[PDB]
Amino acid sequence: KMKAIVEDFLKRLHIFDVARVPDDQMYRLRDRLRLLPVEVRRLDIFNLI
Amino acid sequence: TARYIRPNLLQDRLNLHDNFESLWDTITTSNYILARSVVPDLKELVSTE
Amino acid sequence: QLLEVLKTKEEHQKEIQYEILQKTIPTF
Structure with missing residues (x-):
């Protein structure tokens, strides 16, 4: 269940009261991320694995 | 040897x-x-608070 | 002040009657 990744993400960007922000927006957040490319670096490695 | 008793489920009968x-x-x-x-x-659920 | 001495004199009238009905309903 991805409610996982989003959490960490925002956190690593201090300022935000993670716990103090709903599950909503979060999902919509995924919805947008899913449509994004990967940085060659990142990507190029997964293909390898 | 199995034996049961019919449930008798005739509908509404009485309107x-x-x-x-x-x-x-x-x-x-x-x-x-x-x-x-x-x-x-x-x-x-989502933490009330 | 009036709008609250009349949500009590209208929860007696409302009551008694909402009940005069419940006596027509064989519901434990």
Whole structure:
């Protein structure tokens, strides 16, 4: 269940009261991320694995 | 050796659903509580706060 | 002040009657 990744993400960007922000927006957040490319670096490695 | 007793489930037979309001209300009520007793409780919610 | 001495004198009237009905309903 991805409610996982989003959490960490925002956190690593201090300022935000993670716990103090709903599950909503979060999902919509995924919805947008899913449509994004990967940085060659990142990507190029997964293909390898 | 198996043997059971027929449940006998002939329908309505009596049409109370067209005059005996007083009693329907008492039925509905009943059938209703019955229902709540079953409707599974929910889980994993979003922290109220 | 009036709108609250009349949500009590209208929850007696409302009551008694909402009940005069419940006596027509064989519901435990």
